[PDB]
């Protein structure tokens, strides 16, 4: 990935590591620490820091929200990979490694989500006027996006997907719900925390939506080969369009997420 985005990501990693200090009882915080970092990195989290600085803010104010977003996603990740006994869900061809048993996994996920709200709630700065309102609003966004009409609808509909037999339209919808809403939530939240106004918030949200959707598509093109560059072109266009109107240094970076910048390393390979 690009230099800017790996560094934001590392910031979030260091913040999460500082907030989740493995202490007694270790059968509790050990699994909580391991699973937070065992989950894949999500741009919905970095997109939060990014959009905040993009609208004037200091990524630092968007930090609690970025951590919470990663945390809501990590709990979801763990639950999705839970070994289930009744075979109520296709055991996703892609099985992952499991350091701890199901009971510990289930439970920790259950403990990870509230933790994201704890960091948020507790990040309120008294010497800040609108803090309680933005933080309140961000908590509504995150809990909606991690909720039944959000991430959960995507996880649920994901189970009906059948190996190269499901349409691109259906998969795009599953990715929009599973990834899109969280990315949208992340851009939206960082805008909010960064002081933005409503029109920007609505465009960064729309951007997040398209980008997240596009990213989920990329992550499934390795499980259902068919990803016509038409879909990608589609989401890519939709995203950049939303981005229009943010001119600047930082704005340059944002658009990079969606569309990679011209690099010699990518031409040197193919040559």
């Amino acid at each position: 990935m690009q230099p800017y985005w790996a560094a934001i990501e590392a910031d979030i990693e260091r913040y999460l590591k500082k907030s989740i200090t493995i202490r007694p009882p270790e059968t509790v915080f050990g699994p909580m620490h391991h699973l937070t970092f065992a989950a894949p990195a999500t741009a919905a989290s970095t997109l939060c820091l990014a959009a905040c600085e993009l609208v004037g803010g200091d990524r630092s104010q968007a930090m609690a929200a970025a951590a919470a977003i990663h945390l809501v996603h990590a709990a979801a990740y763990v639950h999705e990979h839970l070994p289930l006994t009744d075979g109520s869900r296709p055991v996703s061809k892609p099985a992952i490694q499991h350091k701890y048993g199901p009971n510990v996994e289930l439970l920790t996920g259950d403990g990870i989500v509230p933790f994201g709200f704890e960091l948020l709630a507790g990040s309120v700065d008294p010497a800040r006027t609108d803090d309680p309102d933005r933080i309140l609003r961000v908590i509504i966004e995150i809990s909606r996006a991690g909720g039944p009409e959000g991430m959960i609808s995507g996880l649920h509909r994901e189970e009906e997907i059948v190996d190269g037999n499901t349409s691109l339209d259906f998969i795009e919808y599953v990715c929009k719900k599973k990834y899109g809403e969280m990315h949208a939530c992340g851009a939206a939240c960082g805008a909010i925390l960064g002081g933005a106004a409503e029109e920007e918030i609505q465009k960064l949200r729309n951007f997040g939506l398209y980008q997240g959707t596009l990213r989920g598509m990329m992550e499934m093109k390795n499980s259902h080969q068919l990803i016509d560059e038409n879909i990608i072109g589609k989401l890519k266009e939709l995203a950049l369009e939303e981005l229009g109107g943010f001119h600047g240094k930082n704005a340059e970076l944002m658009s990079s997420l969606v569309a990679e910048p011209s690099l010699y390393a990518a031409h040197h390979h193919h040559h």
């Binding site: 009882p25 059968t27 509790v28 915080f29 699994p31 909580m32 809501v72 709990a75 979801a76 639950h79 839970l82 070994p83 289930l84 006994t85 009744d86 109520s88 869900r89 048993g101 199901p102 009971n103 510990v104 289930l106 439970l107 920790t108 996920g109 259950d110 403990g111 989500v113 509230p114 933790f115 709200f117 704890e118 948020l120 709630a121 507790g122 309120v124 803090d131 309680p132 309102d133 933080i135 309140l136 908590i139 509504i140 809990s143 909606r144 991690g146 909720g147 039944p148 009409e149 959000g150 959960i152 609808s153 996880l155 649920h156 509909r157 189970e159």
Partner: protein, 277 residues
């Protein structure tokens, strides 16, 4: 006199009406059906009642407490759905009917559980009218802490990762029972007290009271199971007595308040003490 039986029916009646309105059927239908199957399956609504009584006790009203009151019932509900799963207590029945995963499959029970947990935060955050934003934020943090790894969830995990011990003293069994249940009950009282505009000392008093009934609820639970926990250690001939002490000290904290206002909480305390189901 204080008619505790009538008071509860009315609170429960009011709480059930708000839960049914807050979780409607909508797409995806199966996820919402599952949430509703366990949330509205009937139950005593002790947690939502503790919440509403604490808010009322300090000066506020039901309407302000209702969203949080439903939120603690929602987390309570997902907590049982998750506990009933095969990888946990592996229960087939609950409240007279088949457990959630039996009716819907494990995948949905897990998902619907996660939905109730998220939506509990959405609800309090967005539907609480009658308290400024920073009061609400604070309530969310209080709920987070009480159900986190320093709370309900912590208790549960210290309980499963020690489901084959033998040196369980009164400090190991105090933690589990102070967390895997006390925590959410405790948190219910706090959200209410803060939402009603309680002053710090009042919130401090109710939190302590909260602690006692919290443990009391746990202890009383172990007695209803058997008729490694308190029953085992000192045996009912002091286990039923321990509950008696707790209730007392619980009711002793309530002395901070006018006896007329505290009657409901004194009542909910006794009911937590002398309940059969």
């Amino acid at each position: 006199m204080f008619d505790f039986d009538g008071y509860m029916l009315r609170k429960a009646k009011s709480v059930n009406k708000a839960l049914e309105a807050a979780v409607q059927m909508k797409e995806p239908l199966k996820i919402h059906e599952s949430m509703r199957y366990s949330l509205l399956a009937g139950g005593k609504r002790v947690r939502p009642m503790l919440c509403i009584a604490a808010c009322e006790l300090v000066g506020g009203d039901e309407s302000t407490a209702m969203p949080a009151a439903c939120a603690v019932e929602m987390i309570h509900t997902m907590s049982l759905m998750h506990d009933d799963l095969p990888c946990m207590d592996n229960d087939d029945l609950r409240r007279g009917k088949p457990t959630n995963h039996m009716a819907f499959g494990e995948s949905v029970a897990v998902l619907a559980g996660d939905a109730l947990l998220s939506f509990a935060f959405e609800h309090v955050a967005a539907a609480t009218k009658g308290a400024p934003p920073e009061r609400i934020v604070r309530v969310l943090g209080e709920l987070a802490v009480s159900i986190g790894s320093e709370g309900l969830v912590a208790g549960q995990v210290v309980d499963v990762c020690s489901e084959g011990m033998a040196e369980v003293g009164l400090d190991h069994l105090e933690f589990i029972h102070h967390h895997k249940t006390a925590a959410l009950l405790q948190g219910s009282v706090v959200l209410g007290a803060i939402l009603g505009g309680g002053k710090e000392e009042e919130v401090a008093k109710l939190r302590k009271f909260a602690n006692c009934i919290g443990l009391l609820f746990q202890v009383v639970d172990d007695i209803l199971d058997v008729t490694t926990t308190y029953p085992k250690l000192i045996g009912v001939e002091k286990s039923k007595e321990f509950a008696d002490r707790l209730n007392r000290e619980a009711q002793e904290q309530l002395l901070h308040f006018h006896p007329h206002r505290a009657a409901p909480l004194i009542a909910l305390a006794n009911y937590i003490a002398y309940r059969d189901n």
